[PDB]
DNA sequence: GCCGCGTCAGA
């Protein structure tokens, strides 16, 4: 599950510059995409509200701690503020999987400020397997690298079930 | 490229423009036959 | 000029999965080209009762429209052309299949006739509206119809680059391999053994083969017996059609051999059998080449060990000639000619030495160490003949040597540097003039060839065949054109 | 098609094309396109080539058809 | 060892043993230098008199016709430009400067030779002369809101040139070339007779010219041949030759003969031809200052020709660089100004003829109309002038440095072949030979070399180091091409014993300009740099020596076409030329003075400069960033600051990178792991396979901005209305459209959506009776107006970032229009006033910090000066005519719409490597399908091995090995920083990574622990390596780097197929293979057309895709159709498909009907041809023959 | 090529030209006397 | 009867 839609408090399009913000709106969207989210099985879809008045650097951990929503990337910073100001935005989070670039629905936008954001649903960065024979039997060793959103044993069981 | 080649004919109906007119003209005659037995169709043809 | 409507220009893609008679067409281009046909089908269907209604539905790209377009283009031929139509083979007719993307896809074998490559080249597609034209184009303009060149009998559908290389790699045999001396009753058994992978593809095995063979007189005789063959040759046995001897497959299968096999299949089997064989060979080569995973590396090219000694000897000879000239004993022109000859001889010797080391590898096999043919990728590519040539190998592992100036007289100084070791700035500057002169010559010559072809067409344009036999008994005397040396 | 099968009955590769075109025109003018069979089957021009390949139609018979129309 | 903030943030490894003797000269110096001499005078340079001032002085004195009027030039004053370059481009106005000169006229009694003009006209005034365009520091000109660049022109130098055709023996020729006007020529003959011609004419003996003026046997043969008896007879013969059939005049011939070669305005050498002629004859007796021809000079030229026929002398070479000179744009501007001045002087002489005034001032006579038109005509229509390429910063640098021999006074494209296209020996030091057009213009671009410089005479010069007593001196000098031939130059590559003495007795050097082997003692000079011969663009490619010349040229041309990506990525392997290219191009901000950042935001940068270590200054400076600026190539340009609050900075550091620049380094490509194995035939030839991770990661996504302009014009029937009130249009379609009728900013527009709505009236509809019945049945009225709104073309999707509207002139604005304009002006002034106050507030805070330090009068006027600029900015917005432009009369209003759409790489796209290897993507594969290493990391792209053997681009393989080594180095650093992130151990790891190989000795100790942590984070992806083009690292160093990475000493590595997971037999080389995307998208190339408008004259389809396009059918294609014998296809295509008006409509009806019918009565083009013949006396008609 | 000279010579001669060619037919948009066109004529002759 | 100068016309 990854953010597919983000609405800024004061923007009309992605190509705009906020006052007293070093980061660009497109740069903020790029920072938002790398953000990793963990969701409950039944949540399916939810909306996250972030509002900050800090004069320092905004962060993913700054996101309101709503129930169900989990942010793995506390370290990643959404934006940096040169001077004290009020910054707020809303990001929509839904469960999704990668069906390929050609077979992708753009997604409807109702608000004028709504901005479409692409999301990489798959969480497994790398998969490695090796085979060792104990004699009359073998042992299978698999190395799995993940963002840490999903426990490895559960992911392996799900893949075998599929 | 040169300016003379760019100029295009705008006073002559395009084939798509020509085709649609033909379908409309053919459809009306069928409608007149489908309606009045003969007097109404004759009057409509004479007046228009 | 007669610029014509219903024509499309798009980029060309490799399209390997496509068939020899099938090509890949973007859906949007197909819809625009067949939009009137789609309108007619929609009116016949009753989906739209008016031309305007059909146009409005087409504008919204309704889902039902795509299925109707697929039905309309199911059996409809299209013409693919290139900007330089040097020969009639350049324009050909293929059956379009709807594909995603805006990039046109064409069969790899047809590319050689087109003389175009996937470097951004663009092709134009024309659609025949008349029933006679569409049927006529299929009858004579189809890709399957053209196999041999109009100018020469040799087939133009032969594999050009990688497809030949993979076949050459599989056909090669290894003196020592796992499973050597094994006996396989049928091709399926050999394939199962390869799937297990215990045996080696280059390994030598004995296979019993029984099949019909077609004689020159056309008599068919049964061929049976046990023949020793490589595992790769046995795997290629399944592709070969009935009525063709296993002897043609039982060889190194070099690119020249593949063309001869195709010609033999076409002359006796017929065009359809030859086209099927070509498609099977193309499928096999791509699959085997990837499994081979041949790669090109800096280490693969090998510099000659004795090159330094040869260079020193040549420099000593040049110094002796300079010493003779300084005394005034020898004329300047004779000294220059002698220096050029010495440099050419040294360069030729260096090139000859480089070929032996790369081509030949010595290994300590059981019972002693013996020389065997090298498996180096560069040598295989040069030997295969799919790409490259001896001169390029000589330059990369050899020396540039003499460089021609714009006049073309060889410069007295020569480059002992090689591309792998790099070259000095002065040597690169000396080499720059020849490349620039060649590039200038290539662009200028294009107009002359076209003008000459136009004049020839004008002179022979009206000539045609109108009668089976003139009935004249007068002709010409034909004898071998000996040059006095061969 | 390969036109190779059609060539056995017909000669020169030009007479066959002309005969196929005439047969296709006759079939289209026959009212064959009711619209219930075109979708399930190939176009008429290919159908004429298929008939020539079967040899059932007969090239000589096709010339006789022109006089009827 | 970075020594800089940009260097400090990321440290790049460097290679090579060659010391840097001299820094590279400024790239834009040649373009900037020429304009300054024309517009400026420097005492140190010795340019006391500006060329424009000299041109005014030469023609100023007229003394029309004994009118007691004297014209004298006093001074020239240049007006400040009304709008700055940034303001001028947005308005579309051309940057310009007013030119004013002072004229003094003296008047008096005007009696017959007494007191004619000494007692009157003591009053003088400045008169406006014209408008002069100005050049920005980037050396670019903005015309009509469009940036333009004028290419330098190479032309044959004026002088005397002797050449002999080989057709006949002894056929020597003598040519004299003037800077302007006709040039005389002398041709020898087989009999040995001498002939003289001017440009072109009947052949005549050279003796006639001598007769007009007043061991040698040639004169005796020539004198008897000519029948001329006296000079008058010779003059009459010359006049008859000049004009045929024209009667001779007693005084007419004498004036014409002196005027052709003896008029200073008519004939001048420019001071170059005279200097060459005196040197050629070696005579100082003739005055060098006078550029006019002389009898002695002609006699000397004839003597030189006779001496050459005798055999004493050498024929000149036209191809030689010294004969050829380069002409700057300013010299062309000076020539245009001179032509305008000549026309103005003729007008002034005619103007004096009518006088109706008392004590008339000398302002009415001056007319500025002629001068302004000529300069504007040259700039707007100049062949040399063209739109500057905006694809990349490197492209802008390449275009400015380009010198074109083509243009006026230049060889035609087809006229010269096989002579000027070759590279001369002198070309090595002046023009790079690896860079040229691959098209027919190839060999004419002659792109200037980086170290190439222009002398005052216009001859290119190359820097060299002198050698004394076999010892190389450190002195640097510039050698002219003619001077260079005599000396022998040794290459910089030669090694030294540390005493600057060549160790090798025998070295390769050019003594005659041709490479040869010579002793070290004869060498007199050494090359300043290895890359001096190569052009700046060529130096970018790494491992240039290993690559073939043709492939290198193809790669160099392709790199300039590269398109910028959203995120710039620095190349792992770089020559290090990128940093200089970025700094020289003005796409980045450099701090004027050393200062500490006060405030940083992504709209402007505020910096405070300390006076103690700097020259006196305001103490505050403001830099304004540019966001999403549009480009000629439709490429978005934006600037992002790399500075931080309270960060120490120094002059020359880059505060923020701008276009295609990362950390002060230009990047046009992204590093992708690359394998070299054939896969499934997806890359049979040049095809390229993409893993698709790049598409998902937006590795290659670019932003394109499209401007659509809608204008309103007054037709005879009615004035068109842009108001969104059109009948037959649904509210939902107009729902996006605002009440004003302009689409809302930031609103996504679907293809074919309405951007603006306009209605144009129609009359005499003449509806047919069926249409009349339809109107009657539905009671439907017929509209007297039609709608022609502006809509985006199909297949194009974007959002409206900016909207521009221009109102009418002389008409009071409507409350919505007038209120909107006033609101926009207030917002710009109000935002500026608050923004100006913010700078004023920062200055006040600085004063409070320095309040103890005296500010009472120190900055009293500093705030006042800022206020005047703000008032001018408010005035400039209201300073306009009220439409923001003249608007062109008859245009009611205009609107500008800006749309930006992101683009992602797709199949059929073209990617070109720096080494010149190019390919088009054929398909996108899943990540699992792409082959992976034992670690399991996927390979992004797979390349074909066979292509590399066919073309000797060996450099790419070396770069891939170097890229693999860099990738290995990064992983070790990531492992070290993954755990125990402490500065002390990280410093040791960095010392091992950088100091393990090379003699560079980066000395990382200077960087503080805080800087070290940032540097380690930056190096996580890769470690940068810089290789000199001819000083590249050897294979052994790369092998040692691979060993440090822990990879085997080879590029190839074991790989496993993703689908079967089975390792391929044989290891496969893996390299980064840094790649770039060329600007050749397949989106605009589809060009799908079914039915299109036809040419009015020929009734034939338009082509090129400009409107509906369509593919023309070639004549050669007709020949192929004839060979096929498909007459039915050929006949149908020619008539119904193209020019059959009856056939096309019938064919369309049949296709819609589905019934089968064919009509091809005739082709309209043939009828048009018959009409054209019919107009002539010859008659062509169709006929029936019974014979 | 040389269209003006050929036209000037032809006009005085009043030459009457039967197309008798593939090129002449293409200009008039008529079927060429070669390939399919000859076969169609031969089949038509048999039909008569 | 001829040398040697010339037009045109395509590249
Ligand atoms: N892959 C491949 N196939 C070939 C080749 N040559 C012929 N074929 C297949 O054989 C079928 C023969 O089609 P026809 O035209 O009716 O027979 P013909 O070749 O004898 O004229 C075609 O079926 P089709 O109607 O085109 O479709 P399908 O039946 O193959 O699905 C075609 O796909 C070849 O070189 N490669
Ligand atoms: Mg090409």
Task: Indicate which residue's Cα is closest to atom 28 of ligand 1.
Answer: C19
CB contact under 8 A, E1177 and F11: yes
Place of tokens 């402007």: E604
What phi and psi values does residue E454 have, to the nearest 5 degrees? -110, 125
| Pair of tokens at residue C374 | 């090298």
Cβ of C300 less than 6 Å from ligand 1: no
| Pair of tokens at residue E365 | 């006579």
Question: In what helix (H) or strand (E) does residue E479 lie, and over which residues does it extend?
Answer: strand E471-480
Give the ligand whose atoms come closest to the C-alpha of residue D49.
1
* SS3 assignment, position E375: helix
Query: How far is Cα E532 from Cα E464, in angstroms, rounded to an integer?
Result: 10
- What is the span of the domain harbouring residue D30? 1-66
Residue A150, exposed/middle/buried by CB under 10 A (0-12, 13-18, 19+)? middle
Task: Indicate which residue's Cα is closest to atom 33 of ligand 1.
Answer: C19
* E1160, F21 Cβ separation under 8 angstroms: no
Residues 6+ apart with CB under 8 A from E871: none
- DSSP states of E682-728 as a string? TTSSS-EEE-SHHHHHTTTEEEEEEEEEEEEEB-SS-B-B-SS--TT
Q: What was the resolution (in A) of this experimentally determined structure?
A: 4.4
How, if at all, do strands C370-373 and E13-14 pair?
unpaired
Distance E202 CA to G8 C1' (A): 20
Distance E305 CA to G6 C1' (A): 28
Q: Which 3-state string (H, E, C) describes chain C?
A: CCCECCEEEEEEECCCCCCCCEEEEEHHHHHHHCHHHHHHHHHHHCCCCCHHHHHHHHHCCCHHHHHHHHHHCCCCCEEEECCCCCCHHHCEEEEEEEECCCCEECCHHHHHHHCCCCCCCEEEEECCCCHHHHHHHHHHHECCCCCECCCCCCECCCCCCHHHHHHHHHHCCCCCCCCCCCEECCHHHHHHHHHHCCCCCCCEEEEECCEEEECCCCCEEEECCEEEEEHHHHHHHCCCCCECCCCCCCCCCCHHHHHHHHHHHHHHHCHHHHHHHHHHHHHHHHHHHHHHCCCCCCCCCCCCCCHHHHHHHHHHHHHHHHHHHHHCCCCHHHHHHHHHHHHHHHHHHHHHHHHHHHHEEEECCCCCCEEEECCCHHHHHHHHCCCCCHHHHHHHHCCCECCECCCCCECCCCECCECCCECCHHHHHHHHHHHHHHHHHHHHHHHHHHHHHHHHHHHHCCCCCCCCCCCCCCCCCCCCCCCCCC
Of E425, E175, E406, the closest CA to residue E308 belongs to: E175
* C211, C242 Cβ separation under 8 angstroms: yes
Query: How far is Cα E408 from Cα E385, in angstroms, rounded to an integer?
Result: 12
Query: How far is Cα E876 from Cα E867, in angstroms, rounded to an integer?
Result: 14
Cβ of C279 less than 6 Å from ligand 1: yes
Tally of residues, chain C: 486
Residue E1001, exposed/middle/buried by CB under 10 A (0-12, 13-18, 19+)? exposed
Closest in C132, C139, C272 to D13, CB measured: C139
Of E324, E544, E543, the closest CA to residue E430 belongs to: E324
Residues 6+ apart with CB under 8 A from C44: D35, E1154
Q: Does E646 touch chain A (CB under 8 A)?
A: no
Query: How far is Cα D58 from Cα E256, in angstroms, rounded to an integer?
Result: 93
Q: Does B36 touch chain E (CB under 8 A)?
A: no
- Number of Cβ pairs < 8 A linking chain C and chain F: 13
State the closest ligand 1 atom to the C-alpha of D2, by its place in the atom list counted from 1.
21
* SS3 assignment, position A154: helix
Q: What fold, for C306-436?
A: Topoisomerase I; Chain A, domain 4 (1.10.132)
DSSP lists the bridge partners of residue A45 as A94
Distance E191 CA to G3 C1' (A): 15
Which of A13, A28, A55 is the mutation pick for testing E, counting most E CBs within 10 A?
A: A13
CB contact under 8 A, F43 and D63: yes
Cβ of C189 less than 6 Å from ligand 1: no
* SS3 assignment, position E151: coil
Angle at Cα E547 formed by Cα E542 and Cα E549, nearest 5°?
115
| Pair of tokens at residue E1150 | 């049949």
Strand G nearby residues, CB < 7 A? C 447-448, 451, 454; E 189-190, 202-203, 414; F 1-4
Q: Does C71 touch chain D (CB under 8 A)?
A: yes
* SS3 assignment, position E128: strand
List C-alpha distances in Å: C85 to C15, C82, C459, E515, E1115: 22, 6, 19, 45, 9
Residue C315, exposed/middle/buried by CB under 10 A (0-12, 13-18, 19+)? middle
Query: Helices D15-29 and F36-47 meet at what angle, rounded to 10?
Result: 60
Technique used: cryo-EM
- DSSP states of F22-37 as a string? HHHHHHHT---SSTHH
Query: How far is Cα C14 from Cα C36, in angstroms, rounded to an integer?
Result: 30
Query: How far is Cα E258 from Cα E626, in angstroms, rounded to an integer?
Result: 60
Residues 6+ apart with CB under 8 A from E804: E895, E896, E897, E898
- E202 nearest nucleotide via C1' and CA: G5
| Pair of tokens at residue D34 | 């009711």
| Pair of tokens at residue E178 | 């003037």
* SS3 assignment, position B44: helix
| Pair of tokens at residue E54 | 């000299």
How, if at all, do strands E1052-1053 and E506-510 pair?
unpaired
How, if at all, do strands E754-756 and E790-791 pair?
antiparallel
Touching subunits for chain A (3+ Cβ pairs under 8 A): E
| Pair of tokens at residue C415 | 């480059």
Task: Indicate which residue's Cα is closest to atom 24 of ligand 1.
Answer: D1
**Strand order in A115-116's β-sheet?**
A45-52, A87-94, A2-8, A115-116
Query: How far is Cα E1073 from Cα E673, in angstroms, rounded to an integer?
Result: 7
Q: Based on C-alpha coordinates, what's the Rg of chain B?
A: 19
- Residue ranges of E strands in E82-168: 96-104, 125-133, 141-143, 146-150, 153-156, 160-164
- Residue whose CA is minimally distant from G6 C1': E202
Closest-CA distance, E1103 to chain D, in angstroms, reads 33
CB contact under 8 A, B16 and E1091: yes
Q: How far is the CA of C288 from the centre of ligand 2 (A)?
A: 28
- Provide the 8-state DSSP code for E1078: B
Cβ of C19 less than 6 Å from ligand 1: yes
| Pair of tokens at residue C171 | 């056909």
* E128, E372 Cβ separation under 8 angstroms: no
Q: Count CB-CB contacts under 10 A for residue C168.
A: 24
Touching subunits for chain E (3+ Cβ pairs under 8 A): A, B, C, D, F
Torsion sign over Cα E653, E657, E663, E668? negative
Of E1151, E1108, E1152, the closest CA to residue E1132 belongs to: E1151
Cβ of C276 less than 6 Å from ligand 1: yes
Q: Which residues 51-70 on chain C approach chain B with CB closer than 8 angstroms? A: 51-52
| Pair of tokens at residue E175 | 């040519």
* E1076, E669 Cβ separation under 8 angstroms: yes
| Pair of tokens at residue E991 | 């010392």
* C239, C284 Cβ separation under 8 angstroms: yes
Q: Which residues of E39-50 are buried (b: 16+ CB within 10 A; e: fewer)?
A: beeeeeeeeeeb
* C145, C136 Cβ separation under 8 angstroms: no
Task: Report residue D46 CA to chain centroid gap.
Answer: 7
- F1 nearest nucleotide via C1' and CA: G10
């Amino acid at each position: 599950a990854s953010i597919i839609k983000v609405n800024i408090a004061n923007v009309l399009h992605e190509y705009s510059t906020l006052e007293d913000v070093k980061e660009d709106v497109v740069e903020i969207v790029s920072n938002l995409k790398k953000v990793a989210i963990k969701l409950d099985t039944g949540i399916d879809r939810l909306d996250l509200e972030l509002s900050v008045n800090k004069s320092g650097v905004v962060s993913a951990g700054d996101f309101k701690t709503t129930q169900g929503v989990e942010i793995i990337n506390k370290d990643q910073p959404i934006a940096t503020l040169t001077n004290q100001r009020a910054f707020s935005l809303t990001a929509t989070v839904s469960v999704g999987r990668n069906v390929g670039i050609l077979s992708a629905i753009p997604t409807e936008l109702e608000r004028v400020g709504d901005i479409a954001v692409d999301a990489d649903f798959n969480p497994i960065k790398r998969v490695a397997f090796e085979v060792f024979d104990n004699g009359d039997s073998e042992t299978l060793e698999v190395f799995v690298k993940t963002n840490g959103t999903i426990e490895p044993l559960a992911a392996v069981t799900k893949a075998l079930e599929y | 490229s040169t300016v003379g080649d760019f100029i295009e004919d705008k006073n002559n109906y395009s084939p798509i423009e020509a085709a649609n007119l033909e379908n409309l003209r053919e459809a009306i005659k069928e409608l007149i036959e489908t309606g009045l037995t003969e007097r109404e169709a004759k009057v409509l043809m004479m007046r228009f | 000029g007669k610029r014509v409507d219903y024509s499309g220009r798009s980029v060309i893609t490799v399209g390997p999965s496509l068939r020899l008679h099938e090509c890949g067409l973007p859906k949007k281009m197909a819809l625009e080209l067949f939009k009137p046909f789609v309108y007619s089908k929609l009116r016949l269907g009753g989906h739209a009762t008016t031309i305007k209604q059909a146009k409005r539905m087409v504008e919204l790209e309704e889902a039902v429209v795509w299925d109707i377009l697929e039905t309309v283009i199911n059996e409809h031929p299209v013409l693919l052309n290139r900007a330089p139509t040097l020969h009639r083979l350049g324009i050909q007719a293929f059956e379009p299949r709807l594909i995603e993307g805006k990039a046109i896809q064409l069969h790899p074998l047809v590319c050689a006739a087109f003389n175009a490559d996937f470097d951004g080249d663009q092709m134009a597609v024309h659609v025949p509206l008349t029933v006679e034209s569409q049927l006529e184009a299929r009858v004579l303009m189809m890709s399957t119809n053209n196999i041999l060149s109009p100018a020469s009998g040799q087939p133009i559908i032969t594999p050009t680059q990688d497809i030949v290389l993979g076949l050459y790699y599989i056909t090669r045999e290894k003196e020592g391999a796992r499973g050597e001396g094994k006996l396989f009753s049928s091709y399926e058994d050999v394939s199962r053994a390869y799937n297990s992978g215990t045996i080696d593809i280059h390994a030598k095995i004995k296979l019993r083969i029984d099949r019909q063979v077609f004689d020159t007189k056309g008599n068919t005789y049964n061929e049976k017996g046990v023949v020793n063959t490589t595992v790769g040759r046995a795997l290629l046995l399944n592709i070969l059609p009935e009525g063709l001897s296993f002897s043609l497959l039982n060889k190194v299968l070099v690119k020249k051999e593949i063309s001869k096999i195709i010609n033999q299949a076409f002359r006796v089997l017929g065009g359809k059998a030859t086209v099927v064989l070509a498609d099977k060979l193309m499928y096999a080569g791509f699959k085997y080449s990837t499994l081979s995973g041949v790669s090109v590396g800096v280490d693969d090219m090998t510099i000659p060990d004795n090159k330094e000694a040869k260079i020193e000897e040549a420099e000593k000879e040049i110094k002796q000639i300079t010493e003779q000239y300084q005394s005034s004993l020898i004329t300047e022109n004779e000294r220059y000619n002698n220096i050029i000859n010495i440099w050419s001889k040294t360069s030729d010797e260096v090139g000859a030495s480089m070929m032996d080391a790369i081509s030949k590898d010595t290994v300590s096999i059981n019972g002693e160490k013996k020389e065997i043919e090298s498996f180096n990728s560069v040598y295989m590519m040069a030997k295969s003949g799919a790409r490259g040539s001896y001169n390029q190998m000589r330059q990369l592992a050899g020396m540039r040597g003499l460089m021609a100036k714009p006049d073309g007289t060889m410069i007295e100084t020569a480059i002992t540097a090689n591309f792998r070791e790099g070259l000095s700035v002065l040597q690169y500057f000396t080499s720059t003039h020849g490349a620039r002169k060649g590039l200038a010559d290539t662009a200028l010559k294009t107009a002359n060839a076209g003008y000459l072809t136009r004049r020839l067409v004008d002179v022979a344009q009206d000539l045609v065949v109108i009668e089976e036999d003139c009935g004249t008994d007068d002709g010409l005397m034909f004898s071998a054109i000996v040059e006095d040396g061969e | 098609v390969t036109v190779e099968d059609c060539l056995d009955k017909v000669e020169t590769r030009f007479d066959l094309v002309v005969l196929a075109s005439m047969r296709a025109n006759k079939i289209l003018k026959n009212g064959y396109s009711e619209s219930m069979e075109n979708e399930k089957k190939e176009k008429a021009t290919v159908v004429a080539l298929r008939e020539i390949a079967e040899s059932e139609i007969t090239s000589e018979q096709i010339l006789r058809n022109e006089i009827e129309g | 060892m970075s020594y800089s903030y940009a260097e400090k943030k990321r440290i790049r490894k460097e290679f090579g043993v060659l010391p840097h003797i001299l820094d590279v000269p400024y790239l834009l110096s040649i373009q900037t230098e020429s304009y300054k001499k024309f517009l400026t005078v420097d005492a140190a340079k010795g340019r006391l008199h500006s060329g424009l001032e000299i041109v005014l002085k030469q023609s100023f004195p007229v003394e029309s016709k004994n009118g007691q009027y004297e014209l004298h030039y006093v001074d020239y004053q240049i007006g400040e430009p009304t709008f700055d370059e940034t303001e001028c481009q947005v308005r579309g106005a051309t940057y310009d400067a007013p030119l004013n000169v002072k004229l003094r006229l003296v008047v008096y009694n005007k009696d017959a030779l007494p007191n004619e003009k000494i007692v009157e006209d003591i009053r003088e005034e400045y008169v406006y002369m014209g408008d002069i365009p100005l050049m920005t520091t980037n050396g670019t000109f903005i015309i009509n809101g469009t940036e333009r660049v004028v290419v330098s022109q190479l032309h044959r130098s004026p002088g005397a040139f002797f050449s002999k055709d080989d057709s006949e023996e002894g056929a020597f020729s003598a040519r004299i070339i003037p800077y302007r006007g006709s040039w005389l020529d002398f041709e020898f003959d087989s009999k040995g007779i001498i002939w003289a011609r001017i440009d072109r004419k009947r052949k005549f003996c050279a003796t006639v010219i001598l007769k007009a003026l007043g061991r040698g046997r040639y004169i005796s043969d020539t004198l008897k041949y000519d029948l001329t008896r006296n000079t008058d007879e010779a003059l009459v013969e010359i006049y008859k030759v000049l004009r045929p059939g024209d009667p001779p005049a007693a005084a007419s011939v004498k004036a014409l003969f002196e005027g052709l070669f003896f008029i200073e305005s008519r004939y001048s050498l420019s001071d170059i031809g005279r200097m060459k002629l005196n040197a050629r004859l070696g005579s100082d007796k003739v005055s060098k200052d006078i550029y006019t021809l002389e009898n002695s000079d002609i006699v000397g030229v004839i003597e030189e020709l006779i001496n050459i026929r005798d055999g004493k002398g050498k024929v000149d070479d036209i191809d030689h660089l010294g004969n050829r000179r380069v002409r700057s744009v300013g010299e062309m501007v000076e020539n245009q100004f001179r032509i305008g001045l000549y026309r103005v002087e003729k007008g002034i002489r005619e103007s004096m003829s009518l006088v109706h005034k008392d004590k008339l001032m000398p302002k009415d006579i001056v007319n500025s109309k002629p001068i302004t038109a000529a300069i504007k005509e040259f700039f707007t229509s100049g062949a040399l002038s063209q739109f500057m390429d905006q694809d990349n910063p490197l492209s802008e640098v390449t275009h400015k440095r380009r010198i074109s021999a083509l243009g006026p006074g230049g060889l035609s494209r087809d006229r010269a072949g096989f002579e000027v296209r070759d590279v001369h020996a002198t070309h090595y030091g002046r023009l790079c030979p690896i860079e040229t057009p691959e098209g027919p213009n190839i060999g004419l671009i002659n792109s200037l070399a980086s170290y190439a410089r222009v002398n005052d005479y216009g001859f290119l010069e190359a820097p060299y180091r002198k050698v004394v007593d076999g010892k190389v001196t450190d002195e640097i000098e510039y050698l002219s091409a003619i001077d260079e031939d005599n000396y022998v130059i040794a290459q910089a590559s030669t090694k030294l014993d540390e005493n600057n003495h060549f160790v090798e007795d025998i070295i390769q050097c050019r003594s005659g300009g041709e490479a040869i082997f010579t002793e070290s003692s004869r060498v007199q000079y050494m090359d300043v740099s290895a890359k001096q011969m190569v052009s700046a663009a060529a130096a970018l490619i790494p491992f240039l020596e290993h690559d073939d010349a043709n492939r290198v040229l193809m790669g160099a041309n392709m790199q300039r076409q590269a398109v910028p990506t959203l995120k710039s990525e620095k190349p792992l392997v770089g020559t290090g030329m990128e940093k200089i290219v970025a700094r020289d191009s003005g796409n980045c901000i450099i701090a004027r003075n050393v200062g500490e950042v006060a405030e940083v935001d992504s709209n402007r940068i505020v910096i405070k400069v300390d006076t103690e270590k700097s020259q006196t200054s305001n103490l505050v400076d403001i830099y304004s960033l540019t966001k999403f600026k549009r480009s000629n190539k439709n490429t978005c340009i934006n600037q992002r600051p790399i500075v931080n609050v309270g960060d120490k900075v120094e002059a020359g550091d880059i505060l923020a990178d701008g276009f295609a620049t990362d950390f002060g380094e230009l990047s046009l490509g992204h590093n992708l792991m690359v394998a070299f194995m054939p896969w499934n035939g997806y890359n049979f030839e040049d095809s390229i396979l993409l893993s698709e991770r790049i598409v998902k990661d937006d590795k290659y996504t670019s932003i394109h901005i499209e401007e659509f302009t809608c204008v309103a014009r007054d037709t005879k029937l009615g004035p068109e209305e842009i108001t969104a009130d059109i009948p037959n249009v649904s509210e939902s379609s107009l729902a996006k459209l605002d009440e004003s009728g302009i689409v809302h900013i930031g609103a996504n527009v679907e293809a074919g959506d309405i951007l603006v709505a306009k209605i144009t009236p129609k009359a005499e509809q003449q509806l047919t009776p069926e249409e009349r019945l339809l109107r009657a049945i539905f009671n439907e009225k017929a509209s007297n107006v039609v709608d022609s709104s502006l809509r985006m073309p199909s297949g194009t999707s974007g959002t409206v970032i900016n909207v521009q509207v221009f109102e009418n002139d002389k008409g009071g604005k409507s409350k919505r229009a007038l209120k909107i304009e006033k609101e926009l002006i207030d917002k710009a002034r109000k935002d500026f006033d608050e923004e100006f106050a913010v700078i004023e507030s920062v200055v006040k805070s600085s004063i409070e910090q320095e309040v103890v330090g005296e500010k009472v009068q120190n900055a009293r006027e500093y705030y006042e000066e800022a206020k005047i600029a703000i008032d001018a900015k408010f005035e400039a917005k209201k300073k306009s005519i009220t439409q923001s432009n003249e608007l062109s009369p008859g245009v009611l209003k205009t609107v500008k719409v800006f749309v930006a759409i992101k683009k992602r790489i797709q199949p059929g796209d073209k990617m070109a490597g720096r080494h010149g290897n190019k390919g088009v993507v054929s398909r996108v594969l899943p990540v699992e399908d792409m082959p992976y290493m034992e670690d399991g990391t996927p390979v992004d792209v797979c390349l074909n091995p066979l292509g590399i053997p066919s073309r000797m681009n060996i450099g790419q393989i070396l770069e891939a090995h170097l890229g693999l080594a860099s990738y290995g180095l990064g992983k070790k650093i990531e492992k070290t920083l993954e755990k125990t992130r402490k500065a002390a151990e990280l410093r040791k790891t960095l010392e091992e990574v950088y100091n393990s190989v090379g003699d560079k000795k980066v000395n990382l100790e200077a960087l503080n622990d805080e800087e070290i942590l940032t540097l380690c984070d930056n190096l996580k992806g890769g470690v940068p390596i810089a290789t000199p083009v001819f000083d590249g690292a050897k294979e052994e160093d790369i092998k040692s780097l691979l060993k440090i990475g822990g990879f085997a000493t080879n590029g190839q590595m074991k790989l496993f197929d993703g689908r079967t997971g089975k390792p391929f037999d044989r290891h496969v080389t893996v390299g980064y293979m840094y790649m770039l995307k060329l600007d050749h998208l397949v989106d605009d190339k589809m060009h799908a057309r079914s039915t299109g408008s036809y040419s009015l004259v020929t009734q034939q389809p338009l082509g090129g895709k400009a409107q509906f396009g369509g593919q023309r059918f070639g004549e050669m294609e007709v020949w192929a159709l004839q060979a096929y014998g498909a007459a039915y296809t050929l006949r149908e295509m020619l008539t119904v498909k193209s020019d059959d008006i009856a056939g096309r409509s019938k064919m369309y009806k049949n296709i819609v009907d589905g019934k089968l019918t064919m009509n091809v009565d005739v082709p309209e083009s043939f009828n048009v041809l018959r009409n054209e013949v019919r107009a002539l006396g010859i008659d062509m008609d169709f006929d029936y023959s019974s014979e | 090529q040389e269209t003006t000279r050929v036209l000037t010579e032809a006009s005085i001669n009043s030459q009457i030209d039967n197309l008798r060619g593939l090129k002449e037919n293409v200009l008039i948009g008529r079927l060429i006397p070669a390939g399919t066109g000859l076969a169609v004529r031969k089949e038509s002759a048999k039909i008569e």
